[PDB]
Structure formats: C-alpha cells, structure tokens
Amino acid sequence: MKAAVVEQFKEPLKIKEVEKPTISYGEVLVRIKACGVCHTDLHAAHGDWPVKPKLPLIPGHEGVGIVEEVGPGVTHLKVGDRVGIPWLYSACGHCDYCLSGQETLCEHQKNAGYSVDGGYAEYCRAAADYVVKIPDNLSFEEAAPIFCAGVTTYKALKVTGAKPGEWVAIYGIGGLGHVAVQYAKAMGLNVVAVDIGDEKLELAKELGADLVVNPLKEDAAKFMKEKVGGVHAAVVTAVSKPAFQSAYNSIRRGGACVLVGLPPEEMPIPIFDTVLNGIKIIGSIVGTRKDLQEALQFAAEGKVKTIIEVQPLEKINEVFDRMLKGQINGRVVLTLEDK
Amino acid sequence: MKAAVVEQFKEPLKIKEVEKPTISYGEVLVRIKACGVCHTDLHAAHGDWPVKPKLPLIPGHEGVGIVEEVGPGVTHLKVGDRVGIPWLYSACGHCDYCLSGQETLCEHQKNAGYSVDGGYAEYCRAAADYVVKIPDNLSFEEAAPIFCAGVTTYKALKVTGAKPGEWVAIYGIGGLGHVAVQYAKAMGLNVVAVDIGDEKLELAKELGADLVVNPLKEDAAKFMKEKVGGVHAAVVTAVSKPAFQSAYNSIRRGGACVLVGLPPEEMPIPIFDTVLNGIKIIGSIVGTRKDLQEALQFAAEGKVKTIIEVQPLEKINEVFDRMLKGQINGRVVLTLEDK
Amino acid sequence: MKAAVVEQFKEPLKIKEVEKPTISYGEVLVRIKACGVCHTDLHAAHGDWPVKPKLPLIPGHEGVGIVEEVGPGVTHLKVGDRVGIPWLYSACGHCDYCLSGQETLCEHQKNAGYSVDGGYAEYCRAAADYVVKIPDNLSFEEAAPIFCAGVTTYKALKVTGAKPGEWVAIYGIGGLGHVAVQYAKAMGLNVVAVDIGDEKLELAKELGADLVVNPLKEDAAKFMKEKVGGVHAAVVTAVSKPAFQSAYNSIRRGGACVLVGLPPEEMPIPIFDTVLNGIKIIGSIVGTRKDLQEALQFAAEGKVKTIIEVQPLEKINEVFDRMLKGQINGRVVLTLEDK
Amino acid sequence: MKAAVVEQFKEPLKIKEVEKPTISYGEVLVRIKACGVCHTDLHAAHGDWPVKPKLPLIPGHEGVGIVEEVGPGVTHLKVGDRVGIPWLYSACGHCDYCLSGQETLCEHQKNAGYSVDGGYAEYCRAAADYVVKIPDNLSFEEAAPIFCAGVTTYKALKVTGAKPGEWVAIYGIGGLGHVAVQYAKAMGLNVVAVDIGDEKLELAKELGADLVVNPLKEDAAKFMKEKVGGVHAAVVTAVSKPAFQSAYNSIRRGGACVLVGLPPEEMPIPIFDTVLNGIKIIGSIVGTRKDLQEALQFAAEGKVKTIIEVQPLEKINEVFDRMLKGQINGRVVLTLEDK
Ligand SMILES: [Zn+2]
Ligand SMILES: [Zn+2]
Ligand SMILES: [Zn+2]
Ligand SMILES: [Zn+2]
Ligand SMILES: [Zn+2]
Ligand SMILES: [Zn+2]
Ligand SMILES: [Zn+2]
Ligand SMILES: [Zn+2]
C-alpha cells in the first residue's frame, strides 16, 4: 500500500510503498478515503516533543474510511461501516480514568499517527472498540476535520461549563477557532470572537459570532467588560503569553479560562488575582468517544461546517511548509482516493 | 469604646478610645467578645496591597459577639443573638454573583476590617443580612477562627470536587492547614499532609492525616504517586513557587490544584502538561454565608477544632511582630473581655 | 385606583375603586402597565386549593410596570425603572433555601396575587428586592407572560438536565407548551412536540419542533422509541394521568420526567420499572430571580415569543370564563392603561 | 462441578453435578469461594417477575472467587486474580448508556444468576471486562455482600446528592439498611435510622446512626421535622406504601427520595405537593464497575462491615425458607468450600 512516512525527524516525508497491515483479535482494517492534517502531525514529524514518536512513522489521527475486514471478537462493527480513527487509538478500558468516562487520560493509551501508524496511508490497522462511526449524511471530507479539531473545540466548550445564554470568548479564529464559534452557537451560547486579523473576524461574523474585537486595534478585555460585563468563559485556541493574559483578563469572576493549544513555554498567573476572583484555568484536549459522536452529530445536522482544502497525499510536505508559514486558511484534508 | 486602630501604614496600631458606632436601616450593633487575628489584618496594617484600606482603620474580620441592638427593618436578628462578622461585610444582593450564590465575588462588596471598621474593638457596626449566627454549644473563642480560616479551607475542599473516599493533599499544616486536615476527614476524604517541619506532620497525624511526607527529606510528588497513585486534588495553604510546583506534580490527571494563599509573585504553569493532563488550577478564598454556617456546624459537632492562643487587644502589635517572624503555631484570638 | 377584586370565592370579580397602596422600608410602588392572566389566578378566585388566599384579593402575579416611587433603604431601583412582580413576591433571604439559590422554596414566602395584592390594578406595592427588571427592548405586553409561564418552562428544562444535542419531549403545546418548545431550541435541544390537536402540532413545527406526534393517532412513546431511541427527558405541561403515563414511557433509561402542572389527583408510578430503569420524577414550578432574568434575556434576544391576546381589565371575568372552557389559544394579557 | 440449580420455578433447588463451564474470547473461568444470597435470587427461583429467568438456572450474583484461567484477548486479568461477578454480568460497551458511565442501564446487558448461570456453584464462566477485582485485605466472605447490597446502597446515597454535613434518612435497617448507615457516615453524612424494631435501631446506633426513630411509637416525619428540620434526602431500602409515604413526608423541600426496593405494587404520589415542594423521586439499583470498586474500597479501609452468616451451598433451600419468613438478621453468604 501507498503511504506517507517519516523515516527521520525534520526530514521530508517519503511517499512510498509499504506492507499492508494485517489484523487480529479486536482490530479492524480500514481503507482510508481521507485524513485531516493536524499541527500535531507536524510536531510528530519533527519529533520536537519530550515524548518522541516511533520511527518509521505513518502520521495522521484524522483518518476516515471504510472497514475492509473485522478481526476475531469484533461484533459491533461490520465490513462496510464508515468510521474514523482519532488520536485516542486505544485505551486500557479498566483504569480509573477509563471507567469514569475520561478515557482520554488513560496512561496506557496508544495514539494514532504517533505511537502507532495512522491515516496518512491507504490502509490502517485500528482497535475496533476505539474507532468511531460516521453519520450517514456526512462525507468523508467533511467528517475528517471533526475527528480532532471539531471534537477538541466541542469538548473545550463543555469544559467551560457555560450554559445556554452565557457568553464565551473564542481566542483565535483559525483552524480550530472557526469551528469553535459554530459549536458554541449550537450550544446556545453568545460568542465574542477575538483575532488580530480583521479577515478572520468578518469570517467569524458570517459563522455566527455576536461580537468581534481586534486586540491590535483595541483592548480586548476592556471591550468585553464594557460590552457584556466580562465573558463567562474563554477558549484559547492559539495559546501564547499575550493571548492567555488577555483571555485571563476578559473573564468575569468565577469564570473559566480553557486552554486548547500546545505551546512549549510557561504561562505566569497572578496568584492574588486568581484566588480573589475565583478564576479557573483548565487544559483540555481532544475528547472521548462519546464526545466525538456528539461532535459528529452536530455536523450531520448542519450546525457546524469546516472550511477545508483537499489535497492529494503526495502534497503532504507542501502542506506542512504552508502550515509552518501560516499560509493556510482553514483545514487541509488529504485524500488517498482517486477522485 | 476601646479599639486597636491603624492611623498610618507600617506604624504600630494605637489602642485608644474612639466613638461608639451608631446604626440605622438594616444594621446591628455588635458587642465584640473575641476576634481572630488573620494574616490579612497584617497586610491591611501595612497597606502593601494594590487596593489599600481606608484610614484610620479598625482591622478584624474574625469578630464574634452579641447583638446589642438592631436597626429598623431587621427581622431575622434579635438582641442577644450570638453572631460573627466575616470578611464579606456586605454585598449588593442583586448582581449575577449575588443571585447565583457567589456573594463572595460581588464587585460591590465591602470588607470587614479593610474598607469598613472591623472587630478589633468593643463594638462594631455590621450589616444585618451578612452577619452569621454562632451555634449554641460553640464558645466565642472557638468560633472566631472559623469565620475566616475555617470557612476558607472548608470551601477550598468543596472547590476541589473531591468526593468521599478520594485522596487530597494538604500543603502546609499551619494556621489554615491543621484545620483543613480536619474538614477533609469530616468530608469523608483521605489525607496526605505535606510540610517541611516534622513537628507539624506529627500534629497532622494526631488530627487525622492518613499519610505524611516531608518535602525536605523526600520527593513529595513521587511519594504520592507511589503510595496512592496521585491525589485527586491538592489544597495549597502556603502558596510559594516550590510548593505549587510540587502540588501540581502530585495530583493525578484531570485533578484539581486549589490555591488558597495570597502571595505577590507569579506562578509559571506548563501549558503542554496542563492541557495533556486535563489539570485544573483554581483559586479559592473565604466562602459564602451558607459555607460559613456549614463550617461552623462541623465545629459545633466536634469534628473540627482550631489550635488557638488567646491574647488581649493591647498586645496586638506583639502578635503582629510574632506573625511576621513565623513565631506562631496555630491561630491567635484577641479577647475584648477586659475593656 | 381602579382594580379587579375578588370579594367572595366563586363570585365574579368586581372592577371598582380602592385605596392606592402606600409604601415603606424596602418597598416600591409600581404603576402597572400590563398583567398576564394565569390559571393560578382562576384557582385563587375560586379558592379551590388547600391553602386559600386572603380576601378581598387583587389577583395577578404577572404584573409589569414602572416604579413610581422607591421606599427608604432601596438603592438598586430608581423611579422610572421597568420591572415585574412575579409569584415569588418576597422571601426571608436567610433560611437554607434562600442562601442556596432556592428562594422559590422559602417557607416564609409571600405570593403576589394570592397572599398579598397583585397586578390586577393600576398600582401595586412590591418588595424591592424581589421585583425583576425588564430588558429595554422588550414591551410590557411581551414581558408579562414570561414572569410566570416563561420562567416556569425555562426552569423546568434546566431541571431536566438535558444538554445541547439531547432530545426532550414537550407534552401539551398550549399556554406553557408553545413557549417551552422555543426555550428548548434556544437551549440547544432537539424537540418532540406531543399534543392531541394537530392544530397545535403544526404550530409547534413553526416554533421549531423537530418531530411531532398525536397520541390519539399513534403511540407517542413507541414513536419516540423508534424515531430517537427515547427522549432524554420530558416536560409535562398539561399533567393528567394518561399524559404522565405516556411521558413516563417515552423517556429513555436514566431519564427525567419533569412535571409542571398542578392537578388535584394522584399519579401512580411503577416501583419496579422506576428502580430498574433509573428514572427520575421531578416537580418544578416558576423560578428564582436569576432564572427569571435569564428567561427574559432570551425573549429580549428574539429567541422566544409568546402568542398573546390583549384584553382590558374590565373583561377579566370574560377571560376566566373562556379559560375554564379551554377557549383560549396562547396567553391573555390584561392592559391597565386606563383610569 | 457441584452446583445449586433451579429446574422448575417454586420448586426447591437441586444440589447436583453439572458440566464445568468452558470459556472463549473475552471470558475467564472463576473458581467460586463464596456467594452472597440476595432476595433477587429468591424471586428468580420463584420466577415471579415479568421477565422470567432461563431454566435450568444456577442463581447468584454475589459470587467471588479466583480466576483459574483467562480466555483469548483478555489482558487486564491474570490467573490468580481475586474477583467477583456482579448482577451486571456484561453490557455491550457501545450504546449511549455504556459510553456515558451508565452501563447498568444497557439494554443489551446479561445478568448473573438470572439470564446466565451465576455463583451458586464451584465454577462460573464470566465476561472478563465486567468482573471486579477484590481488595487484597478483604476476605471473600466480607467481599461477597458488597457486590450487590453494598454497591446498591453506596450508589443510592450518591444519587441522593447529599453532601458532607447534610442529613439523610435510612428507612429499614436490615440487609441493605445496616450497610447504608455505614456508607452514609463514611460519606460525611448525618443519619436518621428508621425501623419498626427497636432491636434494629440499637444496632443502627452502634453502626453510627446519629438519630433513631420507630414509626410505631411516634410520627417519624414529625420527629425529623422537629429534630433536624427535615432530612435532605431519604433512602428507602424496604419499599412499601407506608414506608414511602413516611419518607416522602420527612424530606425537606427540594429534597430527594431514593427507592432501592423492588415491590410489585404502585406508589401514589401527590402531584400538588411534589411540584410545589420540588421533591424528587429517584429509583436506583446496583451500580457501575466504578461504583463497585469504590464501595469495595470503603470496606477494605474498615469503614463498612456487613453482618453476615456463613452457610454451605447445600443449605440454600433452608436459607430461602428463613428468608421468606424474615428469620434472617443481616446477610447470608454461601461457602462452596466445606472448610
Ligand atoms: Zn490533532
Ligand atoms: Zn485506561
Ligand atoms: Zn452583588
Ligand atoms: Zn482572613
Ligand atoms: Zn402563575
Ligand atoms: Zn427563606
Ligand atoms: Zn442482588
Ligand atoms: Zn451498552
């Protein structure tokens, strides 16, 4: 089978032939039709994180396709089912985290496109219990970006604890942000879109943002304090010292600041201010199988749509470069099918 | 009436005669019998915080006594009722925070012994709706330290979200910490007491701590991972960079780190770690009227006791001096029973 | 002032002149502009409940108007403010219910138009702390029905615990039902409207219902089990033995059945089924001041609109007549803009 | 292997030899050391429920033993592990109930000792994913009764939502009741024990009950209203019309009445009262794997102990007889090992 593979860190991926994966107990073979490209795939290829991935490595944790064959012991899935393989490739299913609906925290978890081969190929071996079905009226292309970006923003909003009618600030209207705006509105929330590019803010208004503000042209925190009395919660998709400080300052007392990004720096927080204002700082990444199913259901109902650009597997290295230079508006989905 | 008053910041308080306060609509005059001394009183006396208190100033937000008279419009309190005047002297009662049981966050709140005169006197004018009744079988001396330290630790434990059977780490077994240990046990929790002084740890064992560990003689975070698999939450009573670091490292994934202290420095937090581990950093201070009633009830039932040292109002400056030099084990309560 | 008053139970109300109420500490005088007519007013007029109202009695707990004057001690309200006087006229503000955001349960509460005079008059004395401000862009006529029917259905939906994306069944699409449908959609829920009159179901579709079913033409519970797999919760606005049984049968395991109606009969519940299916039966009526402000906000944002019929005070007896014989589609609001 | 089997309903069980179960994918063979006797086993033996069990039938869902062998695909369990097989023999692990930590409600569940053979034998084939490990310092005899009675009361207490410091009423201090008292105390709650036999009430006081009251010698509801102002919740272990009526009347407004019993009669509930008082009626049975692990942990910590009587498998029919006649104080556990 054809596949994009990382043979050495920081070296371009090679599109070559590799063995077609074989399956056994509790697994399924998935023929990949599409796979979203995530910033995490880039860091995997560059091995710039503390816990480095395996090598060689087939990246991709936003791979969607059809079940070609089921292994022994698998009863809930059948040949022909349309599914996706998310970041949480597998969990133990028996630890405290797994038994309490927090499988994403399982210490024994395997991650697709990082510790095990992913969706950047024609075929991918997957753990049957952990793949998630794709709604019937959702195309593979539309579905792919929901497997990480969509579920990630949807879960982050649930983590804020904001109920219908309350206000939330979405910092960064990019790959994750433009989707976060849509989930928030679908969840009965009022949104304040924050971003330095007016192009993005206009896009946010088209997607349902009730208010927009550019940090470069005006004080974002002050704007929200004066306009709505401070938001009930903030979701930071583009984590950086300044963005986090602004968000921390725009939330009303007792509010929550939810971080979704993955930067290598440290964020200073005022102890006096945090305690006195009862502020909460929460980190949130991806989501459980239930969260993802819910995230997909909103898409299937037409409440959420991702701005996508389709590209062939061979152009993966081009995509990574455009990503490093921030020359990507929206999300990129690779197709491994002959369109 | 006699009273300890701050005439100038960083100047010793003067024990002198002052006008006996007059009351009107919605207030009560309280004859103070005792008043706990809180580190906050010291910072007020030195005016070292961004929002400085008024001057002259009668400190004290742990004042307990008897209602001498009630003003017009007050129906729930009567002459002779035993009450206390906490930090939250009064709130508006109409804003979002006040209507959703979060009166401690009201932006229009006034604070006892900071923005209005407090309990370091024979008499104190108080807002009737915000004073709290003291259980019948609880002496003024025992009740005083609950109005701040007690309710603070009790609320902080509720904020962790830890349920009976789960583990919590209490960092710093001092004024607040030795009381936190007791509330945690009364709440069905298992406790790991952390402190650099073995004297304190032995005290914690006597107070109910299930496990103890000295950071100076061993890795606290490692001890908790090995012994219990990480605590479900941590309450930091003595906030400092190293203490917060250790606490952040000893909590299991998805756990909560609750800060209670009020230090003027910044705390760096790992963004990558926080997001990946779903960790929560929450600030908590004092508590609502309901929280305080609940906290007092635990004391009245004999499940919580504060180690205290009684001292006359005249020795307030000596108490402050001993406080600055960490020459105090437990809590100090001032007695007004000597005019 | 002019007012519609009940002098004897079961006797038509008399529209006559009466003393203009005077006010004192903590009260405000409200010039009534409109007042909604609620089934509760009818029962009050007939005194058919265990706890009978005072006599003579000026009914109405859906009165909205302008503050003509404020009494001593009132600072959050100014002459000219637009407010409403709900069923919860006043509470003690110090019992456990009142301190834990459950004021509607206060045993010492006074109710508008039942134990104290209501809005069926040109003027009404009200407790300042318990009136609720009306959003600027909401007309008195539109606001009135929200003060009881609106807040009641909104709170009932919050009580179900249904989150965005889940399914709720609304039994009865009448006075309360048609408004419930709208709040549910504004809360991110999918709705199944249930009613014996196809007219009402077509209305529900226009108001946003996702699915409709007529219990007379088909098994409602079976329909919901087949179409959505059982709703997550049900709100019964027209409580009756058959409606409750149907609702109890259409909810999925672990679901909640919320009762909003006030019938004088008893409802039999299967013990075996309830325990085995982990079903919850909850009663809900009106809402707190916070709940009402939140409910009014949705109306002000254009997400909820009540179908109303405006009638002059003099036609009150006509209205009650048409009420008893179910000759009313939607809600009736009395206008008192005459002398 | 030896086993007690039901060949015909309402016919005495036959202790005879039967085939030793064989295992396959995802199962384990468990050598039974002990098995609790539950009232449910009796109803199974008499097939007096709507959904009748299979026949022949080896009852028992409180079976605890040693894993003698693991089937293919099982990695979380090893030979020698000490485990128990609860009522929830298995669930599908993929429906909404299973994915949201409500496995006990899975419509595809199989139940031990009812739809599949249970622990009333020397061996029992079990679903690997649904057996639960027994704490190291807990004997098989002590552990057995926790697998159903223990977890059922522990979960019911969690369902009440009562927090540390609040009051709960336990109706019926028998098999489940005496254990419920202990869990409630371990959960930081204050308990009112209710039962018609003073013998039981004295037992409850020894087990930690704060207050006791006999419905035959005084009004239980009135006693609780006067003594504590109504309990925050009630757990009815012996469901009957009078017991439920009493419980419903002793709970404070907004409180919860949790039913744990399984009677074949109907319970009438006041609609007017329930809506006005915001009372909740919740059914609760057994618990999830997580709940059971938690319940077992409390036992291992010495906070909960079951009063049990050990008897050999052969005496099962005599145990059932004494059970029908209410001649059993506490719980009975069958031993499969002579000695
Ligand atoms: Zn990703
Ligand atoms: Zn796990
Ligand atoms: Zn306020
Ligand atoms: Zn203090
Ligand atoms: Zn009404
Ligand atoms: Zn009250
Ligand atoms: Zn059982
Ligand atoms: Zn299932």
What is the CATH number for A280? 3.40.50.720
Q: How far apart are the first and last CA of chain B?
A: 8
Number of domains comprising chain D: 2
Looking only at the bridges linking them, the beta strands covering A251-259 and A231-236 are parallel
Q: D: neighbours with 3+ CB pairs under 8 Å?
A: A, B, C
Contact C100 B99 (CB under 8 A): no
Spatial contact of C185 and C208, defined as CB atoms under 8 Å apart: yes
User: Which H helix or E strand runs over A138?
Assistant: none
Cβ-Cβ contacts under 8 Å, A287 against chain B: none
Contact C99 B290 (CB under 8 A): yes
Looking only at the bridges linking them, the beta strands covering B167-171 and B190-194 are parallel
Spacing, Cα A108 to ligand 2 middle (Å): 6
- Residue B35 annotated as binding? no
Angle at D104 between CA C236 and CA C256, to 5 degrees: 10
> Of A268, A285, A302, which one is at a domain's C-terminal end?
A285
- The residue in chain A having the minimum alpha-carbon distance to the alpha carbon of residue D129 is A94
Let me know whether C172 and C80 are in one domain: no
Which residues, other chains included, contact D329 with Cβ-Cβ below 8 Å and sequence gap of 6+? D174, D307
Spacing, Cα D318 to ligand 7 middle (Å): 18
- The answer to whether the peptide bond before residue A56 is cis (omega within 30 degrees of 0) is yes
Contact D290 A96 (CB under 8 A): yes
Give residue B153's identity as a one-letter amino acid code. T
Of the listed ligands, the closest to the CA of B103 is: 3
Spacing, Cα A127 to ligand 3 middle (Å): 53
Tokens found for residue A43: 């860091």
Let me know whether D252 and D262 are in one domain: yes
Let me know whether A158 and A260 are in one domain: yes
Of the listed ligands, the closest to the CA of C261 is: 5
Query: How far, rounded to the nearest angstrom, does the alpha carbon of residue C176 sit from its chain's CA centroid?
Result: 7
Tokens 């019926």 correspond to: D172
- The answer to whether the peptide bond before residue D56 is cis (omega within 30 degrees of 0) is yes
Spacing, Cα A99 to ligand 2 middle (Å): 7
What are the angstrom distances between the C-alpha of B115 and each of B44, B47, B56, B65, B112? 10, 12, 10, 20, 7
Cβ-Cβ contacts under 8 Å, B96 against chain C: 290
D142 Rama class: left (phi>0) / alpha (psi -120 to 50) / beta:
alpha
Spatial contact of B32 and B336, defined as CB atoms under 8 Å apart: yes
D40/D51 Cα distance (integer angstroms): 13
- What sections of C110-252 are H helices per DSSP? 140-143, 149-160, 177-186, 198-206, 220-227, 241-250
Let me know whether A53 and A143 are in one domain: yes
DSSP category for residue A165 = T
> Of A247, A264, A285, which one is at a domain's C-terminal end?
A285
Spacing, Cα C142 to ligand 8 middle (Å): 46
Residue range of the domain that includes A212: 149-285
DSSP category for residue A296 = H
Tokens found for residue A79: 């040949």
Contact B270 A270 (CB under 8 A): no
Of the listed ligands, the closest to the CA of D176 is: 7
User: How far away is chain C from the Cα of A228, in angstroms, using its nearest Cα?
Assistant: 13
- Residue A230 annotated as binding? no
Let me know whether D186 and D254 are in one domain: yes
Contact A271 B281 (CB under 8 A): no
Other CB atoms within a 10 A radius of the CB of residue C136 amount to: 7
User: How far away is chain A from the Cα of B9, in angstroms, using its nearest Cα?
Assistant: 20
Cβ-Cβ contacts under 8 Å, B100 against chain C: 101, 290
Spacing, Cα D93 to ligand 8 middle (Å): 5
Elucidation technique: X-ray
Among candidate residues A292, A339, A323, the one with its CA nearest the CA of residue A61: A292
Other CB atoms within a 10 A radius of the CB of residue D218 amount to: 10
Tokens found for residue B296: 């007092």
Contact D92 A76 (CB under 8 A): yes
Cβ-Cβ contacts under 8 Å, C298 against chain A: 165
DSSP category for residue B76 = S
If DSSP codes are grouped into helix, strand and coil, which group holds residue C76? coil
Let me know whether D322 and D224 are in one domain: no
CA contacts within 13 A on the Cβ side of C318? 10
If DSSP codes are grouped into helix, strand and coil, which group holds residue B186? helix
User: Which H helix or E strand runs over D220?
Assistant: helix D220-228
Other CB atoms within a 10 A radius of the CB of residue C242 amount to: 9
Of the listed ligands, the closest to the CA of C262 is: 5
Tokens found for residue D252: 């404070």
Contact C99 B129 (CB under 8 A): no
- Residue B175 annotated as binding? yes
Spatial contact of B91 and B108, defined as CB atoms under 8 Å apart: yes
Among candidate residues C159, C212, C154, the one with its CA nearest the CA of residue C186: C154
Let me know whether A16 and A130 are in one domain: yes
Cβ-Cβ contacts under 8 Å, B164 against chain D: 164, 186-188
Backbone angles phi, psi at D146, to 5 degrees: -80, -30
Let me know whether B238 and B124 are in one domain: no
Strand residues in B38-145 grouped as ranges (E): 63-70, 82-85, 88-90, 110-111, 123-127, 132-133
Contact B26 C129 (CB under 8 A): no
Let me know whether A236 and A309 are in one domain: no
Which residues, other chains included, contact C177 with Cβ-Cβ below 8 Å and sequence gap of 6+? C153, C170, C171, C193, C195, C200, C204, C237, C238
Of B73, B92, B96, the CB nearest to C73: B73
C319/C37 Cα distance (integer angstroms): 8
Other CB atoms within a 10 A radius of the CB of residue D272 amount to: 16
Among candidate residues A235, C82, C98, D138, the one with its CA nearest the CA of residue B288: C98
- The residue in chain A having the minimum alpha-carbon distance to the alpha carbon of residue B107 is A253
Which residues, other chains included, contact D216 with Cβ-Cβ below 8 Å and sequence gap of 6+? D196
Cβ-Cβ contacts under 8 Å, B274 against chain A: 259, 281-283
What are the angstrom distances between the C-alpha of A208 and each of A201, B42, C172? 11, 50, 32
B159/B168 Cα distance (integer angstroms): 12
Looking only at the bridges linking them, the beta strands covering B190-194 and B211-213 are parallel
- Residue B257 annotated as binding? no
Which residues, other chains included, contact B217 with Cβ-Cβ below 8 Å and sequence gap of 6+? none
DSSP category for residue A237 = S
DSSP category for residue A218 = S
Contact D279 C283 (CB under 8 A): yes
Tokens found for residue A247: 């968000």
Let me know whether C235 and C308 are in one domain: no
Of A262, A264, A280, the CB nearest to B280: A280
CATH code for the domain in which residue D315 is found: 3.90.180.10
A170/A211 Cα distance (integer angstroms): 10
B92/C253 Cα distance (integer angstroms): 43
Give residue B62's identity as a one-letter amino acid code. E
Contact C129 B76 (CB under 8 A): no
What are the angstrom distances between the C-alpha of B7 and each of B12, B53, B317, B334? 8, 11, 13, 20
Tokens found for residue C98: 């009142």
Tokens found for residue D109: 């569940």
Backbone angles phi, psi at D51, to 5 degrees: -90, 105
Spatial contact of C276 and D239, defined as CB atoms under 8 Å apart: no
Give residue B125's identity as a one-letter amino acid code. R
Let me know whether A171 and A142 are in one domain: no
How many residue contacts between C and D have a Cβ separation below 8 Å?
118
Q: What is the resolution of this structure in A?
A: 2.3
C193/C187 Cα distance (integer angstroms): 16
CA-CA-CA-CA torsion sign (A53, A54, A58, A62)? negative
Let me know whether D300 and D185 are in one domain: no
